């Protein structure tokens, strides 16, 4: 919930990045997390999506009594139970989907944080502040997982603590 609003301008993925530096702003999406979310959602869809041939009569044109009432009662019980089962299943699956999407977003945030180490500090709006000069190659390195923090650590620590 620490990320307030979504981005309607990023239409190439579910989770992504936005940055600002000396060379401007930009936007890029994360394939690994979007793919993970889609695979989980589709696997859940496939589990949701019987072969009955001869059953009892369910519609009656005459009033008979005991047997007809038993048939009606059995059918009503079956429909009520399956309706409840469907409602419970959809509620549970929707709750799980929302929880897993939020978890994926938090996972990406924590992964970026653990990448940055002492070179950056979280601003609280779900998104970071980097304390050293970071060009587009730098942002690319953070995004694809090849960000080396030791070659910026000195100036990052100088900028972070010593004013």
């Amino acid at each position: 919930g620490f990320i307030e609003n979504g981005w309607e301008g990023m239409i190439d993925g579910w989770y992504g990045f936005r940055h600002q530096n000396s060379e401007g702003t930009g936007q890029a999406a994360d394939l690994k997390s979007t793919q993970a979310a889609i695979d989980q959602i589709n696997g859940k869809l496939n589990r949701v999506i019987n072969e009955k041939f001869h059953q009892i009569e369910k519609e009656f044109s005459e009033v008979e009594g005991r047997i007809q009432d038993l048939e009606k009662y059995v059918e009503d019980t079956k429909i009520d139970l399956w309706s409840y089962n469907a409602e419970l299943l959809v509620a549970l699956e929707n709750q799980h989907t929302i929880d897993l999407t939020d978890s994926e977003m938090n996972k990406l945030f924590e992964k970026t944080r653990r990448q940055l180490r002492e070179n950056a500090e979280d601003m609280g709006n779900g998104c970071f502040k980097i304390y050293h000069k970071c060009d587009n190659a730098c942002i690319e390195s953070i995004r694809n997982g090849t960000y080396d923090h030791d070659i910026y650590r000195d100036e990052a620590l100088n900028n972070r603590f010593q004013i």
């Epitope: 609003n5 981005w7 601003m123 709006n125």
Partner: nanobody
């Protein structure tokens, strides 16, 4: 996401013109609408922008006193009214949605997307 405008208007000098811009595919009251003018053979000229929620408007310091911008959220259409027409006011008028680039708590630039098809307004006797 698209923006659809009105047709051409052959107005006479010393009159008023209203050009409509209907939004479909997005929440109209969530984005700004910008009006850009392109004279025949010349470049684009920003006229102003209108807030589709609170009705605020911000013109350029060249169209003040001649342009009034209004919105209609019920039908999702933004109007531009231009008064005191002249011969030089003949151009193609564009309506564009302005996207702001929000980096958390602050905004940094943006772009115009989508653009309308443009209405050609001609002023002559």
């Amino acid at each position: 996401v698209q923006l659809v405008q009105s047709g051409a208007e052959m107005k006479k000098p010393g009159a008023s013109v209203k050009v409509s811009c209907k939004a479909s595919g997005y929440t109209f009251s969530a984005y700004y609408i910008h009006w850009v003018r392109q004279a025949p053979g010349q470049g684009l000229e920003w006229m102003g922008r209108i807030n589709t929620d609170s009705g605020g408007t911000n013109f350029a310091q060249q169209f003040e006193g001649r342009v009034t911008m209004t919105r209609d959220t019920s039908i999702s259409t933004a109007y531009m009214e231009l008064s005191s027409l002249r011969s030089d006011d003949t151009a193609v008028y564009y309506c564009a949605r302005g996207y702001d680039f929000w980096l958390g708590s602050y905004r940094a630039g943006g772009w115009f997307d989508p653009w309308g098809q443009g209405t050609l307004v001609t002023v002559s006797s």
